[PDB]
Amino acid sequence: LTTFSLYTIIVLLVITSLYTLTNNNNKIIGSRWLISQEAIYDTIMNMTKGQIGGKNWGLYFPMIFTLFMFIFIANLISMIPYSFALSAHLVFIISLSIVIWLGNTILGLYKHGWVFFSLFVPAGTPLPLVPLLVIIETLSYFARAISLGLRLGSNILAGHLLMVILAGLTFNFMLINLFTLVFGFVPLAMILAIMMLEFAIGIIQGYVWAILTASYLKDAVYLH
Amino acid sequence: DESILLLTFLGFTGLVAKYLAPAYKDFADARMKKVSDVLNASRNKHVEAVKD
Amino acid sequence: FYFMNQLTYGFLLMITLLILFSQFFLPMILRLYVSRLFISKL
Amino acid sequence: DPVSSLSFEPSEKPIFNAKTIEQSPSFGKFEIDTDANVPRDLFEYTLANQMLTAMA
Amino acid sequence: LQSTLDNIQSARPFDELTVDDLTKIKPEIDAKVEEMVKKGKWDVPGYKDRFGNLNVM
Amino acid sequence: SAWRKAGISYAAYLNVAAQAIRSSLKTELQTASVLNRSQTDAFYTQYKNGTAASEPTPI
Amino acid sequence: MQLVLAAKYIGAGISTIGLLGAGIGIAIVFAALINGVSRNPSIKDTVFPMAILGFALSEATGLFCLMVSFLLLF
Amino acid sequence: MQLVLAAKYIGAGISTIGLLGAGIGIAIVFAALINGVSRNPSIKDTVFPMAILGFALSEATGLFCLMVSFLLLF
Amino acid sequence: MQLVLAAKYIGAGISTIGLLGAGIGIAIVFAALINGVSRNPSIKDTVFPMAILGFALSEATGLFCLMVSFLLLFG
Amino acid sequence: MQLVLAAKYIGAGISTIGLLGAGIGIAIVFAALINGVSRNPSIKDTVFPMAILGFALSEATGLFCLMVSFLLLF
Amino acid sequence: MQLVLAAKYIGAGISTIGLLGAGIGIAIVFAALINGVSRNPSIKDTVFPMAILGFALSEATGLFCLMVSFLLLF
Amino acid sequence: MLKRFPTPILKVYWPFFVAGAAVYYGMSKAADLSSNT
Amino acid sequence: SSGLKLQFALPHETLYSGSEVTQVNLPAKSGRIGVLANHVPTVEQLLPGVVEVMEGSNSKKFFISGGFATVQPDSQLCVTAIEAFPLESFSQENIKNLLAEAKKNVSSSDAREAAEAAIQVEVLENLQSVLK
């Protein structure tokens, strides 16, 4: 058995613990636990309605929902001090980005094929930089791939280990002589600010994931 | 070494119960009263339309 | 070490939440949308 | 104000000073240079036009 | 319509009605929900006006 | 130039501009509407709180 | 061999100041955020995620340095 | 041989901070973005497509030096 | 071992000036704040919590700077 | 003797950060594009080739820099 | 151990010049203060407590920087 | 519990599933080529 | 709108009033500004110079004695000014220069006359660019 797969089971138990215990007997009125999910559904709905802007825009709206929520929930469990890192396995998150990027390329080649390679020319340019504009495009084409993964877990792995080693700060500050208890309130507020940063580096970075791959969905579905 | 981050967590959640909980309470109460008032008013309006 | 472990159980739970949230959790709120809209429009 | 050729009206027109012009709520909607005295000259232009309209 | 008025008088559960009771009183609700999912018009038009989106952005 | 400090108001600045433009007229095209448009004939008289009088000067 | 751990330490040190480029950048976003609202108060919620979104794109660039320090630290 | 990997460690250290102005630069695009819509509200979803394009290209400046840090890591 | 902690100290030295953009950053935020109240007087209490938002997270990046200079000084 | 390839690594480290200026540079080629075209919305097709003109031949100079790194790595 | 105190000395040397951007930022604070009072003399010493407060806490960054240099000397 | 709806995930979300299987095969290549480090 | 509504207005004859137009070109306080079919709502004081109005038709060349260009937020640009002008016929060099020398002479007088005569010299020398 692995603690990581057990953490994924805890994630699915919280997923059960977000809607079933939320919904009091299928009521119209929309209780307080359901208002948050309503706000999430609306802020993803109105987002990707304007983002990809397609006639077929909602057809990937569940996907752009469910790719968010995993990062939304897995950065609500590692927030506990006595916990192990959930999404800081960079092989896993970068491999997720690889899966999403390759699914985008297969979608674009199944939808467009040879004219999907018409994405390489953004605008009409004079001759001595017409192919070069393609190349820096191709140079960005895997950079479109690699960065979004290599920009999520490296957030989270930078956060909590920080709160490990700066806990070691409190193991290096409150273990020297007794006047360390005098004006020793500012590392407490500093780690407080780091936790304020950590909720941001979970939630807003998950939204960054969502918005960047939503742009990539408009890239792969629509040829410019 | 790890219970100090737990102490920051307990103090932060105490500040959350001080600050964030009444704000989300008032937001939920306001949206609840708004949706309930509109849903009652539309029903009363077409009850009056039935009377007309 | 646990590349197969994390990758395989991650694939399983990704496709699980794909089909799960798709078939369940978006239209269970879309029912609330259509219900409130149909009562308000009468 | 000649309401018709056979009727009329004594009419009032307010003038807002340029102090009010920066204080206006629907004013930052309009893009304006801070470094050109545009309210302090447009108030004069407003005064001149409203005087000309009132006279004519 | 007098009986309709008396029916509106004492049968308004405007704080406790079930959306499953709405699907039961109107299967047109279920039909529009399922068709709205299957075509993919995940926009709910004419909802946001009187029922605001109350989201973050 | 420094008309805002020393010379005219901006309405009067454009008034002097119009007097220069119509002063730079084609004399074939300088109609009577142009000269009557520059027929500065208004007389201003500063009164006081006791309704005193200033000179009715040509503005 | 007595230098290579010291080389890891000072290579971590020269890698560190890249967060500088975050710490300036995010600022002008907030400065533009003030010039999102000083000249246009009625649009600020429009840019209230849209500014801080840019924060999360700039902040992460700083966050893409110190942990490049840390792998050389560990 | 205890010195050459030491030098490639510090070479990864100096090849880190090339994100710096790029970590500035994406933000200044965002700065113009906050002055794009607060000036012109009805271009909000016209520039924001290409600007987040110009984000990624401004990423494409200051990212590859980062992986020059990683390939010299190995 | 006659060289490693000395290199640790100079590594804490070079990891101290990266909060340079602290001393710029928050300050130039305040600069626009001085602009924000100047061209718009009644927006000040509107913007100053947001600006103090534009303070707090804006400086903590530089904190990371010296905590590298706090760690390689000590460990 | 051990330094002739170790120094190539640190030369690759210093000879890569030129894109830094590109991370400053082409950003305003987008950002002045923004506050330009927010100022005039229908100048866009007028300027977006020209901007993607003024992008490309201003970027590739920085793309030379790590190229000087590449030959110094191999 | 003849090297380590001298290294502390040059470490206090390199950890001194962080006040460069501190002076730059407080100069930008007073520069915008002059430019704000030039367009708003009427509100001069209501902004100025907030201006000097942000000045205080913002120059405190470079103050903490050179006192880190002070303790690194010791 | 929850009303199960036949929402399109097989006739719509095929290529991301294909990409997941291909990345599993690439992990087979990787964990049979680079897991002995 | 496709194109733009130009309201080119004068005290004696408002020439254009919501005329559908592609481009206006106007000397404002920031210099010569060309504005196309869309623009930010923007208020500018207008320096006396050459306004070129390009439409679906060709581009007309007028002189303006200053005024205000205001972009009404429905993309209705209102030029509110005083003087219209032909191609070059209303401009005559002997009329301009002989007055300009006298205006340089009156610019040596008292500051009420001197500032105004300096303005007049500026306007006639801007009209020398209309003489071109």
DSSP symbols for J3-64: HHHHHHHHHHHHTSTTHHHHHHHHHHHHHHHHHHHHHSGGGHHHHHHHHHHHHHHHHHHHHH
Residue G61 Cα distances to A146, A199, G29, H17, H68, angstroms: 14, 18, 15, 10, 15
Task: Tell me the nearest-neighbour CA distance from C37 into chain A, angstroms.
Answer: 11
Give CA–CA dist G59/G26, Å, rounded.
Answer: 7
Q: Are H43 and J37 in contact (CB under 8 A)?
A: yes
Among the residues of chain L, which ranges form H helices? 14-31
Residue A101 Cα distances to A11, A97, A137, J39, L26, angstroms: 25, 6, 15, 36, 15
User: 3-state class of A224 per DSSP?
Assistant: coil
**Inter-axis angle of helices A186-221 and A32-51, to 10 degrees?**
50
User: 3-state class of L12 per DSSP?
Assistant: coil
Q: Residue E15 has which token pair?
A: 């704080």
Interface test with I, best of A161, A170, A171, A172 (most I CBs within 10 A): A172
Task: Tell me the nearest-neighbour CA distance from A154 into chain H, angstroms.
Answer: 13
Task: Supply φ then ψ for residue M62, to 5 degrees.
Answer: -120, 160
- What is the CATH number for F39? 1.10.1620.20
Task: Supply φ then ψ for residue M61, to 5 degrees.
Answer: -120, 110
Q: Are B32 and A29 in contact (CB under 8 A)?
A: yes
The residue assigned the tokens 């005290």 is M11
Angle at A187 between CA A182 and CA A189, to 5 degrees: 110
Q: Are I19 and G23 in contact (CB under 8 A)?
A: yes
User: Do K and H have ≥3 inter-chain CB pairs under 8 A?
Assistant: no
Selecting from C6, C35, C36 the residue whose C-beta is nearest the C-beta of A92 gives: C6
Buried b (16+ CB within 10 A) or exposed e, A95-118: bbbbbbbbbbbbbbeeebeeebee
Q: Which domain covers residue F11, as residue numbers? A: 1-59
Give CA–CA dist C22/E37, Å, rounded.
Answer: 9
Domain ranges of chain E: 5-57
Selecting from B35, B36, B50 the residue whose C-beta is nearest the C-beta of E8 gives: B50
The answer to whether the Cβ–Cβ distance between C37 and E26 falls below 8 Å is: no
The residue assigned the tokens 């260009």 is M69
Give CA–CA dist H65/A28, Å, rounded.
Answer: 55
Task: Supply φ then ψ for residue E51, to 5 degrees.
Answer: -125, 95
* H-chain residues near A214 (CB < 8 A): none
* G-chain residues near I46 (CB < 8 A): 37, 41, 44
Domain ranges of chain M: 1-92, 93-132
Residue C2 Cα distances to A3, A157, L33, angstroms: 11, 18, 15
Inform me whether the C-beta atom of residue D13 falls under 8 Å from chain G C-beta atoms.
no
The answer to whether the Cβ–Cβ distance between C32 and E51 falls below 8 Å is: no
Could you write out the three-class secondary structure of chain F? Answer: CCCCCCCCCHHHHHHHHHHHHHHCCCCCCCCHHHHHHCCCCCEECCCCCCCCCCCCEEC
Selecting from F2, F14, F26 the residue whose C-beta is nearest the C-beta of M65 gives: F14
Q: Are C22 and A66 in contact (CB under 8 A)?
A: yes
Give CA–CA dist I63/I52, Å, rounded.
Answer: 17
Q: Residue A185 has which token pair?
A: 């309130």
The answer to whether the Cβ–Cβ distance between A208 and G66 falls below 8 Å is: no
* G-chain residues near H64 (CB < 8 A): none
| Cα M82 to chain centroid, rounded | 8
Give CA–CA dist I50/I32, Å, rounded.
Answer: 12
Task: Tell me the nearest-neighbour CA distance from G15 into chain D, angstroms.
Answer: 43
Q: Are A214 and A101 in contact (CB under 8 A)?
A: no
Can you name the residues that pair with M52 across neighbouring β-strands? M25, M61
User: 3-state class of A151 per DSSP?
Assistant: coil
**Upper half-sphere CA count for residue E42 (Cβ side, 13 Å):** 30
- Say which DSSP state M29 is in: T
In the chain, the amino acid numbered E33 is V
Sign of CA dihedral J31, J33, J35, J36: positive
Give CA–CA dist H40/G39, Å, rounded.
Answer: 11
Q: Closest Cα to residue G7, out of J9, M35, A143? A: J9
Segment (H or E) for E5: helix E2-10
Give CA–CA dist M128/F24, Å, rounded.
Answer: 11
Q: Supply the Cα-derived Rg of chain A in whole angstroms.
A: 22
Can you name the residues that pair with M28 across neighbouring β-strands? M31, M46
Task: Tell me the nearest-neighbour CA distance from J63 into chain H, angstroms.
Answer: 8
Give CA–CA dist H29/J2, Å, rounded.
Answer: 45
Give CA–CA dist M49/F17, Å, rounded.
Answer: 11
Q: Residue A181 has which token pair?
A: 């208890």
Selecting from H25, H37, H66 the residue whose C-beta is nearest the C-beta of G43 gives: H37
Q: Residue A194 has which token pair?
A: 């780091």
Buried b (16+ CB within 10 A) or exposed e, F14-47: bbbbbbbbbbbbeeeebeeebeeeeeeeeeeeee
- Say which DSSP state A77 is in: T
Q: Closest Cα to residue C19, out of L10, L23, L22, L24? A: L10
Sign of CA dihedral M113, M115, M119, M125: positive
For the domain covering I2-75, report its CATH number: 1.20.20.10
Q: Strand M31-35 to strand M59-64: parallel, antiparallel, or no bridges (unpaired)?
A: unpaired
The answer to whether the Cβ–Cβ distance between E47 and C33 falls below 8 Å is: yes
The answer to whether the Cβ–Cβ distance between M66 and F26 falls below 8 Å is: no
Q: Are A187 and A173 in contact (CB under 8 A)?
A: yes
Give CA–CA dist A180/A166, Å, rounded.
Answer: 16
Q: Are I49 and K49 in contact (CB under 8 A)?
A: no
The answer to whether the Cβ–Cβ distance between C40 and B42 falls below 8 Å is: yes
Q: Are A152 and A224 in contact (CB under 8 A)?
A: no
**Upper half-sphere CA count for residue C14 (Cβ side, 13 Å):** 24
Give CA–CA dist H50/H61, Å, rounded.
Answer: 16
CATH 1.20.20.10 fits H2-74, yes or no: yes
Task: Tell me the nearest-neighbour CA distance from L23 into chain E, angstroms.
Answer: 29
Between positions 27 and 56 of D, the ones with CB within 8 A of F are 37, 41, 44-45, 47-48
* E-chain residues near G45 (CB < 8 A): 57
Q: Strand M59-64 to strand M43-46: parallel, antiparallel, or no bridges (unpaired)?
A: unpaired
Count interface pairs G-H at CB distance under 8 A: 146
* A-chain residues near H59 (CB < 8 A): 143, 147
Backbone interruptions in chain A following residues (C to N > 2.5 Å):
none
Angle at E48 between CA E46 and CA E53, to 5 degrees: 155
User: 3-state class of D35 per DSSP?
Assistant: coil
Give CA–CA dist G30/A84, Å, rounded.
Answer: 34
Sign of CA dihedral A48, A53, A58, A60: negative
Cα dihedral value K32, K36, K39, K42, nearest 10: -160
Q: Closest Cα to residue J40, out of H66, H33, M33, A7? A: M33
Can you name the residues that pair with M17 across neighbouring β-strands? M7
The residue assigned the tokens 């399109």 is L8
Which residues, other chains included, contact G7 with Cβ-Cβ below 8 Å and sequence gap of 6+? H6, H7, H9, H10, I7
* D-chain residues near F14 (CB < 8 A): 45
Give CA–CA dist E57/G52, Å, rounded.
Answer: 12
Between positions 1 and 59 of F, the ones with CB within 8 A of M are 1-3, 6-8, 10, 13-14, 16-27, 29, 33, 37
